[PDB]
Amino acid sequence: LDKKEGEQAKALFEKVKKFRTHV
Amino acid sequence: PAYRILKPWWDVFTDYISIVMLMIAVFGGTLQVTQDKMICLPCKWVTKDSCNDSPTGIKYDLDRHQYNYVDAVCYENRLHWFAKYFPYLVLLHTLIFLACSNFWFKFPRTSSKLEHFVSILLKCFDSPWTTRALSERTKSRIEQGIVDRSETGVLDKKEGEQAKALFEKVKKFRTHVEEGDIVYRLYMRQTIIKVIKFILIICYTVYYVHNIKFDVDCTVDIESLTGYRTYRCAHPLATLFKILASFYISLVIFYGLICMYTLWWMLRRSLKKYSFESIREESSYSDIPDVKNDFAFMLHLIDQYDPLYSKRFAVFLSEVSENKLRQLNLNNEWTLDKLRQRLTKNAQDKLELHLFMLSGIPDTVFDLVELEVLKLELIPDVTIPPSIAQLTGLKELWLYHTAAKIEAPALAFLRENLRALHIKFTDIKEIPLWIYSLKTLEELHLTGNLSAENNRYIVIDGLRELKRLKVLRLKSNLSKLPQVVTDVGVHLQKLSINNEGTKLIVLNSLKKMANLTELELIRCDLERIPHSIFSLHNLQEIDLKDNNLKTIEEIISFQHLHRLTCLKLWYNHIAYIPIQIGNLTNLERLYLNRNKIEKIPTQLFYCRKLRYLDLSHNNLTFLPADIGLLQNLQNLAITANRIETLPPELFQCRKLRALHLGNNVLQSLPSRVGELTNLTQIELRGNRLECLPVELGECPLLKRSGLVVEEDLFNTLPPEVKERL
Amino acid sequence: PAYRILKPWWDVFTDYISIVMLMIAVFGGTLQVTQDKMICLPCKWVTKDSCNDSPTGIKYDLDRHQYNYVDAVCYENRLHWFAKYFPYLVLLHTLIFLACSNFWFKFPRTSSKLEHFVSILLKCFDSPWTTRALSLDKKEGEQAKALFEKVKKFRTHVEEGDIVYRLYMRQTIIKVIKFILIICYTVYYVHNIKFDVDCTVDIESLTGYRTYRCAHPLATLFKILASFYISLVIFYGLICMYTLWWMLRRSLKKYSFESIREESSYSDIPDVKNDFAFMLHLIDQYDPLYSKRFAVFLSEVSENKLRQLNLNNEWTLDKLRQRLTKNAQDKLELHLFMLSGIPDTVFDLVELEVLKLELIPDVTIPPSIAQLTGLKELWLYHTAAKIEAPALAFLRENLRALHIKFTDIKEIPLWIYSLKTLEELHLTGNLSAENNRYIVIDGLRELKRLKVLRLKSNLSKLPQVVTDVGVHLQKLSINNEGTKLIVLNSLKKMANLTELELIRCDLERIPHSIFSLHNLQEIDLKDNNLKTIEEIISFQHLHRLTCLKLWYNHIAYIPIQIGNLTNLERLYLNRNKIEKIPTQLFYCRKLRYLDLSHNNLTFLPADIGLLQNLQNLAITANRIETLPPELFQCRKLRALHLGNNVLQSLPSRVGELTNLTQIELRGNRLECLPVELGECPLLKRSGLVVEEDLFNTLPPEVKERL
């Protein structure tokens, strides 16, 4: 992950969960 | 930027309606200019009017040219003016609706506030801090929720700085926008004028439809020029213009209905008042502001564009969010390199660190595994995050008027540590009910003023279970000491009361404890020494100072005790020493300072193991030859007493390491004291010595550190003491 | 961009009106080209009253083609002059008004001022420095500084301009002129727009009829367009007149920041009187916020703070402490050698008794000295002297010594007489007779308290301010140039003089006004042109001389009057090429320190053995043969410095003293060295400079033992 894909994927996961919850 | 502030029933429909209205104006206009012919023709059967009341043809016998003239006259001098200028009318109305809907747009007095607002709008769905913020018996002792929710993550000085800048900007931009209501006023004015023009347009245009006709009876006065008086005349475009007028009227009605909705909306609910109530209802953040002006109004307008905006903005504009941000920013800067700047030590060192200027508790401080002492001064919201587990030792913690909110789940750590705890307090209840939960606390310092009632409640519930309490210091008025003190008192080794408001009987405490291996009464308003103090068989130390104590006559029964070893009597009014003190020989310390002592009988010499004596600021003017017997004397002050030149017995001793002479009469120090060789310091001040002895060369420890002199000449020794230095 | 310099009640309206006016020209133009027909037709009635009134048809036997001719003629040389060219009158004036509006843009000598003006305002507006200035990470300093330099150069350039202001006025004026004229013409010529007109052109020879009646088909549209046009123009004119009102009832050639200055952190703003002021008013009209951000940015007070912050962010307390050293009379010596100013962090060093400043411009030392406790000594050298801090009491409680160095005359401040607690002063500098007299009066005349005074200068003559102040003088020193040895009335006035030093001064002979100074107790005469010691005979009759240094001179001869002295604790006979020493030095048995070096002695007398208290003895570079046994007939001889002499070996007996702390043996050509020397407890490689081990027994033993 080169210690950055973790952050990137995690941010996307949080956004997806909030988006999904809203939709 | 209009797109992000696009209004559902204000901009959306209006723009498409306006486009259609313009299109119909253009279509009609083009036709009106070139397709309008108005074909007229004369008629013969004229009775009253209309040329009626009647195959080869007629043969009117008129010139093709003159017919065009007739057409022009009938067109100009007849009715249906509405039809003649219908597309111009439409164009005007269309332009009015278009223009009135866009005054604010591109107009500096309004666009300025919109630009500030929009700048914020474009940051709420950006600056990742926002999305981090959006991620969300008891007895005030439980906070593991916040411990795990923060995930101990960082902002890496990026989200930190971005969010900080946005906090400065949201506060400033709001302060600017919040000053008035121009944006609000314009939208209300615009909404109302749209409705006004709508009503007028419909009334005007539905009435003048009776003007659009298949034909007209043309009765213009031109027969003297063209022969016929009455003409019948056709207007082909009239069919189409009835249709166009109808379509335009319907279009305006649609516009009107929507405009009524928007006017309806702006009146049914207050728009300036606006707060994120829905956020505190759903979210963990109850910290919701409410202002009534253009800022709130503009937020309210976009609330109906997307609720997501409101969620982002609301969590950002919060002091909860800012406080979390600040703690994270603290960690970003206040790292090990900064902590090291303050890693000092004073005495019984234990590697201290005191955090005074911080607005909260850093987490980085618990990376200082090497420290044993942490001092917190005036820091709010102290939870002590449960990441103290990486520390090994923690021998002392100072809660120096900080916060009672210690609720982190790390009592197990603290219960294996904290031999000492210091609590400074100005209030009554900022002292947490945390202390008794610690079991390994041996030493407790309580400083601040509590009433007898407060002493009883705070001590009974906050402290009573400290079975290992050995040292207790109470800097409080203590008009009564709660029974907790006497109960811990039977295991308690040291009890110290140090306050000006102390006025009480402590005899019961002294009797119950019967131990108190160290006893202190400092600034207590005492004149009388409680007689039960002599039941403390293991007293081993007693400090009676800054009292109204004016007598030592009472210390008669000290021999009831064993191993006293120390008696401090400084800053009192004991102006006289009796002959009871000579029966106290099991003493290794005696201090008589500023007590205005006029005389001391030769009694001190009996305590041949005294070794340390302070005789100062007394109107004594005398040194007995006790000094010639106490040959283990290492430290003695003879100052501020106007003693004459020191008697030779001064040097008939062995060490007298600290020779403090001053504010007396001494033309010359007996030179023979220099042969003790154990002098480490000589103070010769305010005594008017003429010269200094030249026999001090015998003592190797009078290098130029211990030579506290006024002259520093009349000698040959200066280079020796300088080289030794 | 241009938007932010557009005028709120001027330009948006001008553009919208210009657009609509052009629309009218376009509509009317097209209309005029294809719809104007002038249907005219003859009449048979009384032509004296234009065919008045005093069913089949009239017939009028004319051909259709012939009628086109009639219409054309009636159109060409009859009525409707205004209507015929109405859309062109509209187009022409509309274009003029529009061109006038945009005249100041894209103009040869306005664009450059405007472009720089806008760029600067935007940079000031969005600069974090402006925000901080409202009350740097080492980069905002550079950014703000660059903007400040650009602003100063921009302002200087614009300062000489009067173009933007004047062109705008000319433009406003011409719009008003054209406005008045267009109304006069457009409003007046409307009586020519008629539907029905009378055509009486003389074409009878071609048509038979002379009088024709005629219908202008667009009379109504031109009346409508003209009325709508006039109203557009009047509105336009209201703004044009407003502009002159605004431009004439407000100076606008000048701009003040008073309404901002009393709200913000700055006070140092000049009254702008040029095109910059005019441009400032225009942005003030758009949005005052830009006037404020600019004003906050442009401030000398702000520049001072910016620079001060740069110093504070570099010269932090750790940076200062790390570089804080001590060399002699320690007192925490902190040196700041290349700073652009003085950081505030230096005043949090409460314990910093010594501060040394050099090469620092504009030093002012803001009064935050109260934060400090000890400031016992201050060195101000080759810096600046603008310290006017209203805090003499703090300074007086401290600054026992001041060391101040100068390169010119006027650089010297007068903070000396104001500190009457001063004990010690050191002055170096460029002097002259009058320049020194004037400054020394102003500087030292009131310091009765002064005890120590040293001057490094080309003085050439001793001032009497010093001799008068000197009545309380403990220590006096002067060097690097000869002065008239004014001793006859100087030493007598000073009279205490317990330490005198004369270095590199043109002294060939010793003055004799020092001979009666029994309280001298210390005297150092070195690097002088003095080549003798003949004067020192009765000089030594004074008790307690305790020190006589005659080194670095040309005194190759020592007399035996030297035996007159019994009280001496230091004697230096260094680099004088002396060829002999008499046994007359021992008389001072308290001597303890004797320097015999760089002479041409070649031998030593039996004087050493008479000084049992000789502790420090230097015998170097004198070509002295094997040292006489008196060398070790003493009790201390802590320092035995031998070198550049001739010694085959040390006598073993000197090593039996055991009080030797160091023996220097360099350049003496020793063949060997005895073992007794290694027995001495303090010669264990303690400074024992030797060329070789010299066949000794315990050199590795003493090396390990140390």
Numbering used by the authors:
A (entry chain E): 232 to 254
B (entry chain F): 15 to 68, 94 to 175, 214 to 802
C (entry chain A): 15 to 68, 94 to 174, 232 to 802
Could you pull the original sentences from the published paper?
To produce homomeric SWELL1, human SWELL1-FLAG was recombinantly expressed in LRRC8(B,C,D,E)-/- HEK293-F suspension cells, then solubilized in 1% decyl maltose neopentyl glycol (DMNG) detergent, followed by purification and exchange into 0.05% digitonin for structure determination by cryo-EM. Image analysis and reconstruction yielded a ~4 Å resolution map that was used to build a molecular model of SWELL1. The ECDs, TMs, and ILDs all share the same 6-fold symmetric arrangement; however, in the cytosol, LRR domains dimerize in a parallel fashion with each LRR at either a 10 or −20° offset relative to the rest of its protomer, producing a 3-fold symmetric trimer of dimers. The nonequivalence between identical subunits arises from a hinge around the conserved residue L402 in a helix of the TM4-LRR linker. In the extracellular domain, 25 Å above the membrane, a ring of arginines (R103) at the N-terminal tip of the extracellular helix forms the narrowest constriction in the channel structure. Therefore, R103 is a critical residue within SWELL1 that impacts ion selectivity as well as pore block of heteromeric VRAC channels. Within the pore, constrictions are observed at pore-facing residues T44 and T48. Near the bottom of the pore cavity, a constriction at the intracellular face of the membrane corresponds to a short N-terminal coil (NTC) sitting parallel to the inner leaflet of the membrane. The first 14 residues of the N-terminus of the channel are not resolved in the cryo-EM density, presumably due to flexibility.
VRAC is a ubiquitously expressed mammalian anion channel implicated in diverse physiological processes including volume regulation, cell proliferation, release of excitatory amino acids, and apoptosis. Previous studies have shown that SWELL1 is required for VRAC activity, and that the presence of other LRRC8 subunits dictates functional characteristics of VRAC, including pore properties. SWELL1 is organized as a hexameric trimer of dimers with a four-layer domain architecture and an overall jellyfish-like shape. The transmembrane (TM) and extracellular domains (ECDs) surround the central pore axis, and share a previously unappreciated structural homology with the connexin and innexin gap junction channels.
